[PDB]
Every structure is written in structure tokens, then in C-alpha cells.
Amino acid sequence: GSLVLSCKKFPHVSVNYVVDKTPKLLTDCKEVHNCSYIINDATLLWNEASRKPRLRPEVCTYIKDSKWENKAVKDSFIGIDLTKGYDDNSLVILKEAYQRYEKTLNPEKTTFVSLRHHIIDIIMCPFLDEPLSLLMTVQPDKNILISVDNKKICYTGFALEDLLIEHELYYSIVHGSLNDEIDLLIQAEMDSINTLTDTYTEIKSSVHFKLGNTYHRRKLLRMWIQTNLLPKSDLLIGFRNSYSNELEQLKAYKIQDIYHKINNSSIVGKPGKFYKFNPNVANDWFQHIFQVLKQNLLLLSQESTSTTFKVQIDTNLTLSISPASQFVTAL
């Protein structure tokens, strides 16, 4: 019924490996549906009916020209205290998205269905000092559903998005191939669209980067995995002054740009434990546990009455799978 399996010796490229072009985590990755969820109307508007959050035009223009139209516009973003005014269910949508796209899945492969956050968590295991715990359900159609079960920093993040974007949430449902045996159907929340480039733009709040600092290398790698799992997507980072909390600089990054910042023949020269946060090793790890997870969840599910399993991964990359009660549903 259960399984304990070490995955620490997973096949992977040298920790110092450098290649100029960023690798792709998924192949043939595409957006298959999108939807806006108006929370108070308990309504999902799909595709042509959804409302795409627009990245402010002054901001799209700033990104395109690498310069502000004028002082008035620049002073509406740069210098603003992202801390002003601080003293103040997702699994349901994934399942509707699955129902809408199921007929289109590849019956010859196992598809993992999940919110993007959990795919990122799984790829991040070798780069973290905390373990991972998730639920993975082998559905009767044999596809697998993944699920689960600092206030100031998080708030300046909402303020930054608030300031750059013209409640409600927006989601892109993407499909991609990981293996000759595995596909992924992922749900991702998109902060906005750059209307000039028709490109999703994910907004991140940050203090200037200190490569060398473990926390920042983790964030940069996560950022890279985050956009790399999508078909088209750019990053827009708002750096704030550490002391004043004022937005000091806005900087756009394409996937190749975040990639280059974390993979060079120069950054790879410094010592480090977590596989030196190499995006290429993350990619190898990605290819590995997903194949291990697929083979094993399928094997265990035939020989069991349980369709749901607790999936765990040590900080030593030891994988643990045990059946969860057939009388318990995690929503």
C-alpha cells in the first residue's frame, strides 16, 4: 500500500553547467482556456467572456521605451510608498477547467492536473531546506489530480500590483508535455496583460537582489520556474528601497533574462549547497520525480482501494507515498 523511495541520486547535469539559451520545462505548451472569477457573483466567465486585467498603459509604454512619458507620469509610480495604507476556492475552478478540457487530453499519456503553485513546489524540493507534503489523487480515468491539506512583505506586493494594474481573479489554464508518457494541465493566476505586447505580465515585489544570498537565489529560481511553465509570459519587477519602502525602479524581464541572471559561467563560480540553484538541475529533477511519481502512484492505485495518496518529499529528497482515507475529501 505504501512506498518509501530515495530520489537523491536523480540523474542531473553538473551543478556548474552553463548553457546560454534557457531550457523549456514543457514542450508544446499552450493556453487552452482562461477565466475570470468574480468573487461576489460566485461566477466564472470563460474565455471570450473573461475580463483580462490590464497592465496600466503608462507602464506598458515605460516598458516599451525604457523611459517614462514625463515627470508627471513617472512620479505616479516611482517614489510611491508601497507601504501606505498597510494599517488596514481554487481547486473548484481547476476541476471545471478539467471537465472542459478532458475530451482534449491525450488518452495515451498520464496527465497531472494541478494549480501552478504545486508544480513549482515539487520542482523546488532540491533547492529548499523544508520538506514538501501534498495530496495526489489517481482518478478513475487514470489522470492524476494534485492538491493539498510575513504580513508586511505580502502587503507591499498587493500594493505594487494595485499601482501597476488598471474583487476579481484571472486564470490561464495551460497544457504542456513533459514526457512521452506525461502531460501537465495547469492553472495559473495571471496578474495582468501588457496590452501593447499582448503578453501576460507577472508582477513581483522585491528589494534589490543579492546573488549570494540564499533567499534571493531561491526567489529568482522560483520566478524562472514560474514563468517558464507558461507558453508566453514576461516578468515585471518593482524594487523598493529597503528603508523607505518606496518603489525605486520598475524593470521588465523576459524568461531568457531571468535565466541569464541565474545561469552564467560567472555566477556558477561561487560555492553552494542546493545544487547551486541551477535551473538546469531543476529541469533534470523535474523530469525525474514526475516519472517516479507517475509510475508509482499508478502502481500503488491498482493494488489498493484508495484513489488518494499523501505524497511527501524529505529535505533529503526521499519520496514517501501512503494511502489517505477513502472517507476523507480535501477541498
User: 128 with 274: CB under 8 angstroms?
Assistant: yes
Cell numbers placing 294: 507517475
CA distances from 52 to 48, 195, 213, 233 (A): 10, 10, 36, 14
Instruction: Quote the strand ranges of 104-233, DSSP E.
Output: 110-115, 132-138, 144-147, 168-177, 182-189, 193-194, 199-206
Q: Is 69 annotated as a binding residue?
A: no
Q: Is 130 annotated as a binding residue?
A: no
Cα gap 222→116, rounded to integer Å: 11
Q: Is 202 annotated as a binding residue?
A: yes
Domain that holds residue 282: 1-331
The phi and psi torsions of 162 (rounded to 5 degrees) equal: -55, -50
Q: Is 161 annotated as a binding residue?
A: yes
Q: Please say whether the dihedral angle defined by the alpha carbons of residues 293, 24, 30 and 109, taken in this order, is positive or negative.
A: negative
* Half-sphere exposure (Cβ direction) of 69: Cα atoms closer than 13 Å: 9
Q: Is 257 annotated as a binding residue?
A: no
Q: Which value in Å is the resolution of this experimental model?
A: 2.4
**CA end-to-end span of the chain:** 24
Count of the separate structural domains present in the chain: 1
Technique used by the depositors: X-ray
Q: Is 303 annotated as a binding residue?
A: no
What is the pairing mode between strands 27-38 and 234-240?
unpaired
Cα gap 97→70, rounded to integer Å: 43
Q: Is 173 annotated as a binding residue?
A: no
Residues 6+ apart with CB under 8 A from 5: 292, 296, 318, 319, 320, 321
What is the pairing mode between strands 193-194 and 182-189?
unpaired
Q: How far is CA 209 from the centre of its chain?
A: 20
184-194 b/e (C-beta count within 10 Å ≥ 16 → b): bbbbbbbbbbb
The phi and psi torsions of 37 (rounded to 5 degrees) equal: -110, 110
User: 242 with 187: CB under 8 angstroms?
Assistant: no
User: What is the DSSP secondary structure assignment for residue 69, as one 8-state letter?
Assistant: S
